[PDB]
């Protein structure tokens, strides 16, 4: 029912668009004000914040959210540190988007419940679409 | 049951791996010899070729393959050129991976039959997966 | 007659100077404010704008003008994007300068109405001039 | 009608293709062998040579040719040097392609009879086509 | 006194040369072979290995060593992965070199016992030397 | 005591913060205005200047300061140039940060009094620290 | 007695300084204002002008000057064009500095009386000083 | 007399040709094999080597040659490193080419014996020659 999306790039904005269209509460958070404004029309609440900051994550009651999506791709350290801070905050399920295999390995060892690699996973999906 | 995959990045090798795992015969083509070498381990046949060159595509006989997947991600110019050359060669079905919506619309004008945007499509898929 | 010329390099400023000398009112658009300044001296109206942006092109009201000339030479990606946005804007006639045969074919697929290859067309003209 | 084209670029090939179709003899010269092979099937004679080499220009006997077209654009210094050597060789009329206004100013002082600026010249022609279309 | 040093850059080789001069057993591990050859003259044992490989770290048997120094600076992700792999292997104390504050905070969160930032720490020590 | 620190990277700002915390007046000089602003909060006086410029250094009056620390790390040419200009300006004690053994020897020839290698010296220090 | 120097780079300024020491009138002219100010204290008259401008060269009566030195190095086209304009200006003796062998070929044919190639010419003398 | 010239640009190849034309044996060293091949035509021995590397310079035995000319122009870092390594090797006389006054002063501190500025010294000579003195 209630979801949080951290990082509002192309991937995260798509997650927010689908989640809200399905009829759920989505807290969209991105350090960049332009993307938060872009996603403000779609999501229930759009907040400009740095999720690498521990006190900001404490203030945003992410432990109350059923699922938290971390969609930071460019800076691997940002995604790893956001995952660590979210896990320390008490978030039970953390979904993290990873662009590289080393990042996926690190995130798996940290404790992310779901690691999403968009290029490989769509590779498999479109291969299955081509087969049938 | 014969497919051609152009570009052997994370998406292209994932489509090849899945297509060859499902029994189909894949021709992997890329300009980077390292990725052609790593794909040649499992693909039916792997070729180091430039797919933006008209005569090279004629040598590859891409018109024989029922589906041609173009997975050139970083070089949008190369992706557009490869789609144009494949369409003018006589390929019935051309699937193209596009990074952004503008490239997707240009590819729609070119004649690409299926256009895959990995980030947005994974956003939609992951949102549906988290919903239920 | 109202004309819009996008890109003010050697070809774009030559088309504007000819169009305005012939008594026509031309709009000169370029991202380089330096080149917009020379045009503003003799051009009915000169604007510093990015013509690959959909909202910017909507602001320019290019659909009012009879013909839109896109003279972006070095950046082929910008030329393709500008032609696509102009066609999507709703301009009746688009003339695009293309420095490559492949770019010309892509622009034909996009929807450009007249495509000028200055080097090849000038070569044909010079050959005809020497013959006669 | 006997012509010579030096520099088989995009501009150079366009001149070579149009000249042969009418039925005039064309000599195509380019330093790069690959471009010479491209015009080999579109000209009377295609020769790989360096046209800034003074002795080579003498061997080609460019003074026999009615018109010579120098179509070197990327290196401004070669086009200026080739123009001077062609003029010293005794060629009556030399047509030179200039990409920049600074290059065209030098070529006028050098003695080129016709300076072609494809971007500026096609800009005027295209605008006149827009006027009456 | 038995030590292990991972990464044989300028910093790592300096820790290996001081440790060997003081008379203690040092294991020098580096992915690059010629740096291993450079350090082989000093250390008791120099091994060319990849320390982001779990099985390789298991074969190296690092839990015997009193202290393990991870001195990988250029790629932050490799340093984080090696640190967490060594922690999972059962190393009692892990000392990690960090070049950035983001890397240092990530390493602090993942469980590094000592984080060394050579620029900041040497800055403090040099200022103290200047004072007296 | 008055100290001048040139270059405000990780090493230079650490020396300034340590020097100023002990009651000494520090002059912080850098070409990057962002780091000069960051240092200006706690540094007695901060100046945006190019210290390879010999006329600029005369304006800074570096001859007055007891010790001049040059902490230019990435630009080695700027490091030797600043050391040379400081020596020619009549500075009694010049401390220079060097990133390589070859740069250190050139700085010794120039006239630097103390040369600090952050990676090598901190490596020796941590090697001693683990032993004891 | 009376000389003119066009271009006040490192080479041109060196000519002006030595010419003044022998008690000769020198007209130092350069497009860049800063370089003219440097030679203002070393020449009889220092003028900021563009010597590529034909009318400007007409005003600066260079035909009265015994020798004119063109010392433009970076832009090959300016030195060639300035040399020609000086020839129509009536300058009997024109000395031109050339940095490349191809430029020295053009300058010889256009009529430069003396072509100076500082690297090649200094190469010959330094060898002679080494021999004796 | 045996000379060593490091760097085979315009200045370096001009010094080698004059030193070999005067009957002396020159060792031309450069990292660019293309320029080493050009010098190998007339110099006694030409070697492709990196002269900022201590072991490489020890292999060249530069201490044998009485004069070593370092003619690295664009890379000031390489010029300074080569001067330092040649001086440490034990070369009695090191001549270095410098582009600016700051590089020249650094090379003076390094230990270069003669420092040549091509532009400034050529300007001085051109002034003297125009003065006809
Ligand atoms: N510390 C952070 N806190 C919150 N959002 C962040 C943080 N760091 C980056 N982001 C956001 O995550 C988004 C994902 O970035 P990225 O994957 O590079 O998408 P894009 O390639 O479109 O920029 C960025 O737009 C950025 O604004
Ligand atoms: N003209 C071309 N012809 C064939 N393959 C190409 C061409 N241009 C790029 N490629 C390949 O397409 C692959 C996908 O590109 P890229 O997205 O950069 O890789 P990744 O998916 O790893 O990010 C690259 O590995 C590249 O080698
Ligand atoms: N997105 C854009 N919108 C408008 N003008 C553009 C855009 N991108 C490039 N231009 C301009 O279009 C012109 C293309 O000409 P170009 O070939 O770059 O220069 P020239 O013809 O002078 O050699 C330039 O003035 C360039 O700045
Ligand atoms: N010295 C020379 N003699 C003869 N031909 C030359 C010489 N230098 C250049 N050329 C030719 O002139 C042609 C000009 O091509 P150009 O259009 O400038 O190349 P590009 O299309 O890469 O810009 C080149 O194809 C080149 O082969
Ligand atoms: N996966 C790995 N396993 C072991 N050693 C590694 C690994 N990755 C990098 N290294 C080593 O760590 C060292 C880090 O040194 P670095 O700080 O990069 O020195 P420099 O900055 O001079 O390159 C490198 O010498 C490299 O060989
Ligand atoms: N010529 C110069 N004059 C003054 N400061 C300089 C000069 N060149 C570089 N610096 C400064 O020295 C600082 C240290 O450089 P660098 O090592 O690149 O940064 P960091 O130490 O943060 O990695 C830089 O912040 C830079 O602004
Ligand atoms: N058209 C011109 N008229 C006068 N002086 C010029 C002109 N073009 C260049 N110069 C000057 O000629 C000098 C030659 O400098 P040059 O060696 O080309 O460049 P740099 O100063 O970067 O070394 C410069 O001081 C430059 O300002
Ligand atoms: N580390 C090095 N060891 C030996 N030779 C070098 C080194 N670095 C540069 N050189 C050579 O010094 C020569 C000086 O060339 P440069 O001055 O850049 O070109 P030019 O002399 O044509 O202006 C270059 O040809 C280069 O190959
Ligand atoms: Mg994104
Ligand atoms: Mg990919
Ligand atoms: Mg143009
Ligand atoms: Mg061409
Ligand atoms: Mg290192
Ligand atoms: Mg630093
Ligand atoms: Mg200069
Ligand atoms: Mg040189």
Curated annotation (Swiss-Prot), chains D, H:
Binding site for ATP: 10, 30-32, 50-51, 72-74, 97-99, 119
Regulation of its activity: Requires both ATP and a high membrane potential for activity. Binding of ATP causes a conformational change in KtrA, which promotes formation of the KtrAB complex. Can also bind, with lower affinity, other nucleotides such as NADH or NAD(+), but only ATP can induce a conformational change.
Main location per the UniProt record: membrane
Gene Ontology cellular-component annotations: plasma membrane
RCK N-terminal domain mapped to chain residues: 1-116
Keyword field: ATP-binding, Cell inner membrane, Cell membrane, Ion transport, Membrane, Nucleotide-binding, Potassium, Potassium transport, Transport
Bilayer disposition of the protein: Peripheral membrane protein
Subcellular location: Cell inner membrane
GO terms, biological process: potassium ion transport
Transmembrane segments: none
Gene Ontology molecular-function annotations: ATP binding; monoatomic cation transmembrane transporter activity
Family recorded in the similarity comment: Belongs to the KtrA potassium transport family.
Summary of subunit composition and partner proteins: The uptake system is composed of KtrA and KtrB.
Functional note: Part of the Na(+)-dependent high affinity K(+) uptake system KtrAB. KtrA is the regulatory subunit and plays an important role in the substrate specificity and transport mechanism of the system. Binds ATP but lacks ATPase activity.
UniProt-recorded name of the protein: Ktr system potassium uptake protein A
């Amino acid at each position: 029912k209630q979801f949080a999306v951290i990082g509002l790039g192309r991937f995260g904005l798509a997650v927010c668009k689908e989640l809200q269209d399905s009829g759920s509460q989505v807290l969209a958070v991105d350090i960049n004000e332009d993307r938060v404004k872009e996603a403000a029309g779609f999501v229930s609440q759009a907040i400009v914040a740095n999720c690498t900051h521990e006190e900001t994550v404490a203030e945003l009651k992410l432990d109350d959210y059923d699922m938290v999506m971390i969609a930071i791709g460019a800076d691997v350290n940002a995604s790893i540190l956001a995952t660590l801070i979210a896990k320390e905050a008490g978030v039970k399920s953390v979904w993290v988007k990873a662009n590289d295999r080393f990042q996926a390995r690190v995130l798996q060892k940290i404790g992310a419940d779901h690691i999403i690699m968009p290029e490989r996973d769509m590779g498999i999906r479109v291969a299955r679409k081509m087969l049938d």
